[PDB]
Nucleic acid binder design. Structure first.
Ligand SMILES: [Zn+2]
Lengths: 148, 187, 1012, 184
DNA sequence: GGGTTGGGGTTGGG
């Protein structure tokens, strides 16, 4: 009954693989993991990926202790610039001598489409990792017990 | 020590509550989507002027004090607070609104926030205000939320107001999540 | 020259706006962007939608939306998902069509209000549009463009982009305002003449009390130093001390004293009150007239006020000359009209700052910055003027007089002494109690309605031999949680009954509501009369007396309950309408915007849930257009629901438990509905339409039974009937009399105006007073029985004309105010009866002649007031009109432009777009010459205009005559070329012009148009 | 929005239509032939169908739907209803913007359905024509509800908390008593 | 601790 759920790269991978393997579901873009959802919360390091001949779409990468996911970054059309939250990451990366950092990212995924990443914030505290893990486990338990 | 409740718990208790009931809660959440369609501020006197007599040419005169008063601007903001569970609309008053304004921009002084907003609006500089409000999006905090089951215009309604806003720190929130999950596993 | 056209295109109008740089339809935009190709095929409906849809943008963005070969266009998301993405991208911006009725929360959008325009957004046409376009381009097209879709013959509905209403949007001192309106309608009376006991004059019985009661003026910011405040306080103390020594009784007896037979009138009133039996009608009328002939004169009241002021206010407070100036202007203020008021500048601009002696300056700015010193002292002089007036003059007039206006005297003001008004109030109460009002007790009225509905107030206007009660419902009860008055409560039912009014027009009776309906009915009857062959005509005129009070509550309730034209449930929709104004399109100084061409109006509508033909659910509006010019509509997100049961409860409450107050005495109606409620007219029309359709069965079949042309209209309680059969007229009179006898109502004065004479004995009409006239007069309109032409009725004297004119002039917007006022005065009534289907060319000329002759006398006081101010002291006007004849140049420019605009509008109304431009120009020149000749003839005798201005006006008139003659001469050569084929209307115009011999001069047409 | 639906007064229309159905059934089955009364008393089949008149249309927000059992949930303000619809054709006729859920719809017409089951009578409400007007994604938390798919047990539930629900339940029970008295 | 939308303007018929 909630459209936003927190999960990590491995959960993304298994959900996508299961949806592709078994497409006999409802004719709607919503995924199915103890319900329908469109938003996800994940904390992992981000790194730019250099695409070719692909100006409108910017390809990302989120490697984590469980796996890696590919996301697409969209930019404005009337003028060619970057969203402020990603310009902040770019300037931080150039300032800190090209060192990647973990980020707290919120991203939207739909089946038969790429995974769009809307916003993220750079995290500098390590306790956020444990916070995200515990929140993930608690939310999964809540969803499982609310299904029944 | 304090006890923290979730947005869904607050919603269920507010619904089950009878008219005229109040209760306070402390929630880990993030502010989002500040609304500015309605009037952003109102005028009050220093002596708590209940009625402010409007005149022309920026003239003001309180009734609770009966002196020629310089108008005092009080900032009124509407936004939405939301945890991982649910989202609700909240009322933000002058003190908290000024606190967030000074936090996002240290240049503007605490009580100077309302005057700064009024000056920008009257001069016709709304892009700056919009960008400042947008910079506050997904700002994690610790919220003290109170709900009131009150009747307005012979219509029942529930109103949510934020009382305290504190800087967030992950340690005790993670501890609370850990004990909650351990309790759930034990049960 | 530029002419107004009855048919216009939205794209053509939009291309005339400088702000918008790119305007095109959707199909051509798609072709330019190469999203589609001509060789491609589409459904006919989709093609028509693409062609009709109109888009616009502030800049040229064709290149930005150019087709890209990098990636094809295939759609997998839903239209709702695309719209949500666009709304999220919009962010904090809060003025767009698509955001109406919805809110954004993070990356989630929420819908909470009803928006009738969302159907077009989510339609299959927009689905196919998105399929063609693509998600990334659609999300930005919904923002970068203004989308208009045709939904009617000429109507368009905006569905995306910035809302059009956004285009229709260091301080200086503003002086206070004289509260002149407080004088009117004061019914309070006190044992000792003077002022109210609440005033500071009476509250005092030291400087402490006066300071406490006058802090609002004592602690003003205009005072330079504490010494000024102390001096003002001393002056107030002296004023208060002087006030208590005034013999008000002696002053009243000297200046405005009661009539000699006042004791006799009081005795007569007491006898009438105490008499048990009904009083004599003629005696009561004579008493009313005698009481009303005791009014006080303007000069008498001015002398009274001057005597009061002189011995109460020290002469040094304002200065020797300023005091005299104020006293002189006091008379002008006294004689000032009801909806008119004075200004502080009217006194400030004529007194001298330096006359005041007690003024002190902290800094020696008297010689350094004289202008700054003058402004600073003016700020205090105005405060002193306002204080004096609003604290002495207004309270005295309020306490010691009742001030109001008569019934047929227009806006003219009259004064009456308080005891006379007390006697009048007692007599009026006695009259009303016997007929329709009863004293009421709060015990009877149920507490539910008592706390749910506010009560009304009663006001009485003097009349010749009688009165005219008026009840108002403005008040709202602070207690019992009431925040609205009766009209605000009932405006929902008002909307419902306004919807009912549409089918009330023609279905179940003969009811009319506006000059458009009257004109179309007249045109149809005129056409039928022409078809018949111009036979003789007869008319009858009669009206109902006190229609509102003669309404049966039970019958009205039964009609409401059994009427099927009112549905069970209705929904309320709010929307904004943009409509073309009366301004011709400029042909291509650079700042051209929507308000230059469109007028914004707020509209509400109530619609039923049936699958009605008008299908309001699809559009959200229901508008009637008299032209082909386009209009734009945008919906809103504030819907409401109303049920027939609520209307039933409201009707029952207003019929039964209507409570009004007077002199702190409560009253309750006994019969009928109260006048002044927003639904009273519609309810009365419906109620009487029921009875008239009951009793007018024969008229339904008469026009084919024997082929007799007959016309019947009823406006509220007034009846007009024109027919060809005297038998039909007599039958109608008999049937109406029978209906009145059966339903318990009667007609006013037992008087009837006819075009014939008949024996009243046969039809038991002896009590009627038949008046025979050869010219019908209805609702202020004059109708001919020979040519069947209609023109309005105008007054004949300047004294009559001035009684209905309120003059308000502000220096800030002189040009705009005068232009709009003159425009409204000319277009007030002429536009509604300038239909060429009714009058001929001569009739139109005569109508314009008489209307202009009335309007010039109407507008004369405006330039008389204007000449009281010299514009050479204002830079804004001096830089534009010089310094020698600024007033004359300003007036000439205003008159010239107003006349030109009026002539253009008149030509547009008279002729269609197919008529020749030469004919249009000739007629415009003729009308302009007529107007200018009337104005010149009127103004050639006035002394103020006797010099410089008259030569300019004569030059303008001569130029117009010359242009008309030249156009008439050239038209012959133009038509001789055989290049044009003339229609019947053009031939008629040519015959008219040739018959009147406009080639040489105008002396032939003047006797025909000036006949009275 | 809640006020707009509360002003509809759905209870009035429901009571009037129930009274009309009861009266029509009473007058149309005055034959009182014993063998006919016996033979139309059979398990799980409809016996009468009364279509509502044009005056009693109302609008509600769809909260949930179930295609397998043809169960549709309606709500407005404080009260939510669970009714059935004729078939999928009703859904296809209603040009839904995105989804049946969270969409504001107007009921063009509906009909009361009477059924005999488990030695008693159950009254069913079937929606016949549907029309969507605009999408309302606002969750209304209805404290109170009545069920038309469970009969007297599904209607008399939670009656003590609403006066209108109490009156409608009393009318329903009286209608059931009259029907059983006439038929048996 | 807040809260329809308060005005501005005044002509011609009823
Ligand atoms: Zn104060």
């Amino acid at each position: 009954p909630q459209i936003t759920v927190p999960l990590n790269c491995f959960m993304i991978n298994q959900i996508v693989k299961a949806a592709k393997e078994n497409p006999q579901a409802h004719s709607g873009n919503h995924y199915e993991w103890y319900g329908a959802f469109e938003n996800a919360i994940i904390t992992a390091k981000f790194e730019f990926l250099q695409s070719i001949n692909d100006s409108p779409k910017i390809m990302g990468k989120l490697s984590d202790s469980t796996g890696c996911i590919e996301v697409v970054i969209q930019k404005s059309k009337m003028s060619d610039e970057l969203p402020e939250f990603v310009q902040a990451y770019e300037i931080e990366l150039q300032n800190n001598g090209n060192r990647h950092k973990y980020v707290r990212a919120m991203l939207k995924m739909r089946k038969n489409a790429q995974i769009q990443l809307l916003y993220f914030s750079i995290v500098n505290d390590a306790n956020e990792i444990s916070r995200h893990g515990l929140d993930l486990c608690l939310r999964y338990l809540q969803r499982k017990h609310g299904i029944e | 020590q304090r006890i923290y409740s979730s947005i869904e718990e607050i919603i269920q208790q507010a619904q089950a509550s009878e008219i005229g009931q109040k209760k306070e809660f402390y929630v880990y959440g993030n502010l989002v989507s500040i609304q500015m369609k309605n009037k952003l501020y109102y005028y009050r006197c220093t002596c708590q002027g209940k009625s402010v007599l409007k005149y022309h040419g920026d003239s003001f005169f309180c009734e609770s004090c009966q002196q020629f008063i310089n108008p005092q601007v009080h900032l009124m903001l509407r936004a939405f607070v939301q945890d991982s569970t649910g989202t609700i609309p909240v009322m933000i008053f002058d003190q908290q609104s000024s606190q967030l304004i000074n936090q996002i921009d240290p240049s503007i002084h605490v009580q100077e926030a309302g005057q700064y907003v009024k000056n920008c609006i009257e001069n016709g500089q709304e892009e700056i205000i919009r960008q400042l409000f947008s910079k506050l999006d997904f700002a994690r905090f610790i919220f003290e939320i109170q709900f009131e089951n009150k009747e307005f215009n012979n219509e029942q309604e529930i109103a949510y107001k934020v009382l305290k806003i504190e800087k967030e720190n992950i340690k005790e929130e993670s501890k609370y999540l850990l004990k909650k999950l351990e309790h759930l596993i034990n049960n | 020259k530029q002419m107004l056209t009855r048919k216009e295109d939205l794209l053509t109008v939009l291309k005339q706006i400088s702000a918008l740089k790119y305007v095109s339809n959707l199909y051509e935009f798609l072709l330019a962007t190469e999203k589609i190709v001509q060789t491609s095929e589409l459904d006919t409906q989709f093609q028509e939608f693409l062609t009709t849809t109109i888009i616009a943008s502030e800049q040229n963005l064709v290149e930005n939306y150019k087709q890209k070969y990098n990636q094809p266009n295939f759609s997998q998301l839903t239209i709702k998902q695309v719209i949500d993405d666009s709304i999220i991208l919009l962010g904090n911006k809060q003025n767009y069509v698509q955001q109406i009725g919805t809110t954004t929360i993070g990356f989630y959008v929420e819908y909470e209000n009803i928006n009738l325009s969302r159907q077009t957004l989510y339609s299959s046409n927009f689905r196919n549009l998105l399929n063609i376009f693509g998600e990334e381009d659609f999300k930005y097209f919904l923002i970068d463009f203004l989308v208009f879709t045709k939904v009617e013959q000429n109507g368009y509905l905006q569905v995306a982009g910035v809302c059009l209403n956004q285009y229709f949007s260091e301080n200086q001192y503003i002086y206070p305002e004289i509260q002149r309106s407080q004088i009117f309608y004061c019914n309070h009376m006190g044992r000792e003449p003077g002022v109210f006991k609440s005033s500071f004059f009476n509250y005092s019985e030291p400087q402490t009390i006066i300071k406490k009661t006058l802090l609002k003026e004592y602690q003003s910011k205009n005072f330079s130093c504490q010494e000024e405040r102390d001096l003002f306080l001393e002056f107030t103390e002296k004023i208060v001390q002087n006030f208590h020594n005034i013999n008000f009784n002696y002053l009243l007896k000297k200046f405005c004293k009661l009539p000699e037979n006042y004791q006799s009138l009081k005795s007569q009133v007491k006898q009438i009150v105490q008499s048990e039996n009904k009083a004599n009608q003629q005696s009561c009328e004579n008493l009313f007239n005698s009481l009303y002939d005791t009014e006080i004169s303007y000069k008498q009241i001015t002398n009274f006020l001057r005597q009061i002021i002189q011995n109460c206010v020290p002469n040094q407070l304002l200065g020797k000359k300023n005091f005299k100036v104020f006293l002189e202007k006091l008379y002008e203020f006294v004689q000032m009209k009801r909806f008119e008021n004075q200004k502080v500048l009217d006194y400030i601009c004529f007194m001298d700052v330096f006359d005041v002696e007690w003024f002190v300056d902290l800094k020696n700015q008297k010689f350094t910055q004289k202008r700054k010193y003058i402004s600073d002292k003016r700020k205090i002089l105005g405060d002193l003027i306002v204080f004096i007036i609003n604290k002495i003059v207004i309270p005295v007039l309020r306490y010691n007089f009742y001030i109001t206006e008569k019934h047929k005297e227009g806006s003219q003001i009259f004064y009456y002494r308080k005891p006379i008004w007390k006697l009048v109030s007692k007599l009026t109460i006695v009259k009303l109690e016997e007929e329709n009002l009863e004293k009421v007790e709060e015990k009877l009225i149920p507490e539910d309605s008592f706390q749910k509905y506010p009560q009304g107030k009663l006001r009485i206007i003097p009349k010749k031999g009688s009165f005219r009660p008026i009840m108002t419902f403005l008040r709202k009860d602070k207690q019992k949680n009431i925040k609205l008055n009766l009209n605000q409560i009932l405006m929902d039912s008002q909307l419902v009954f306004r919807n009912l009014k549409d089918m009330l027009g023609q279905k179940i009776g003969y009811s009319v509501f506006d000059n458009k309906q009257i004109s179309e009915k007249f045109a149809q009857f005129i056409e039928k009369w022409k078809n018949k062959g111009r036979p003789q005509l007869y008319y009858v005129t009669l009206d109902i007396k006190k229609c509102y009070d003669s309404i049966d509550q039970m019958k009205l309730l039964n009609f409401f309950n059994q009427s099927d034209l009112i549905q069970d449930t209705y929904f309320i929709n709010k929307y904004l309408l943009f409509q073309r104004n009366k301004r011709p399109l400029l042909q291509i100084m650079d700042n051209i915007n929507f308000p230059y061409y469109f007028n914004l109006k707020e509209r509400q509508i109530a619609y039923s849930l049936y699958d009605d033909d008008d299908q309001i659910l699809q559009k959200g509006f229901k508008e009637i257009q008299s032209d082909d010019r386009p209009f734009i509509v945008i919906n809103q997100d504030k819907p409401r629901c109303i049920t027939k049961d609520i209307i039933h409860n409201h009707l029952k409450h207003i019929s039964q438990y209507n409570v009004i107050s007077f002199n702190k005495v409560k009253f309750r109606q006994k019969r009928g509905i109260p006048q002044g409620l927003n639904i009273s007219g519609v309810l009365c029309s419906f109620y009487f339409g029921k009875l008239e359709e009951e009793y007018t069965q024969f008229l339904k079949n008469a026009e084919q039974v024997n082929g007799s042309i007959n016309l019947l209209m009823r406006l509220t309680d007034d009846y007009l009937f024109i027919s060809d059969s005297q038998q039909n007229a007599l039958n109608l009179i008999v049937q109406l009399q029978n209906c009145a006898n059966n339903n318990g109502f009667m007609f006013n004065d037992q008087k009837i105006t006819t075009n014939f004479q008949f024996p009243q004995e046969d039809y038991n009409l002896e009590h009627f007073k038949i008046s025979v006239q050869n010219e019908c007069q209805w609702i202020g309109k004059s109708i001919d029985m020979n040519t069947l032409e209609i023109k309005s009725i105008q007054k004949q004297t300047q004294q009559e004309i001035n009684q209905t004119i309120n003059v308000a002039i502000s220096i800030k917007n002189l040009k705009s105010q005068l232009k709009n006022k003159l425009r409204s005065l000319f277009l007030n009534q002429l536009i509604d009866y300038f239909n060429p289907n009714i009058n001929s060319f001569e009739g139109l000329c005569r109508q314009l002649y008489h209307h202009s002759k009335a309007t010039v006398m109407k507008f004369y006081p405006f330039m008389t007031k204007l000449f009281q101010i010299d514009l050479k002291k204002s830079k804004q006007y001096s830089v534009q009109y010089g310094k020698e004849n600024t007033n004359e140049n300003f007036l000439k420019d205003i008159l010239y432009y107003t006349v030109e605009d009026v002539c253009k509008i008149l030509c547009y109304l008279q002729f269609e777009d197919e008529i020749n431009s030469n004919i249009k120009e000739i007629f415009k020149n003729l009308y302009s010459w007529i107007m200018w000749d009337i104005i010149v003839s009127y103004l050639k005798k006035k002394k103020q205009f006797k010099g410089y201005l008259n030569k300019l006006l004569q030059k303008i008139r001569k130029s117009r005559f010359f242009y008309l003659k030249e156009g008439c001469k050239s038209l012959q050569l133009i038509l001789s070329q055989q290049k044009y084929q003339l229609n019947k209307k053009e031939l008629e115009a040519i015959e008219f012009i040739d018959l009147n011999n406009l080639i040489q001069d105008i002396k032939t047409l003047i006797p025909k148009i000036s006949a009275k | 929005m809640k006020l707009l639906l509360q002003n509809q007064n759905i209870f009035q229309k429901l009571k009037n239509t129930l009274n009309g159905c009861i009266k029509k059934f009473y007058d149309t089955y005055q034959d009182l032939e014993q063998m006919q009364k016996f033979e139309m008393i059979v398990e799980d089949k409809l016996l009468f169908r009364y279509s509502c008149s044009q005056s009693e249309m109302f609008s509600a927000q769809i909260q949930a739907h179930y295609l397998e059992k043809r169960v549709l949930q309606l709500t407005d303000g404080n009260v939510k209803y669970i009714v059935n619809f004729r078939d999928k054709g009703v859904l296809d006729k209603a040009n839904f913007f995105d989804t049946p859920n969270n969409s504001l719809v107007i009921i063009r017409q509906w009909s009361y359905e009477i059924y005999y089951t488990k030695n008693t009578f159950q009254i069913n409400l079937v929606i016949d024509e549907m029309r969507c007007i605009d999408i309302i994604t606002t969750i209304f938390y209805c404290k109170l509800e009545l069920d038309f798919t469970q009969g007297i047990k599904g209607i008399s539930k939670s009656s003590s908390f609403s006066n209108q629900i109490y009156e409608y339940s009393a009318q329903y029970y009286k209608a059931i008593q009259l029907l059983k008295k006439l038929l048996i």
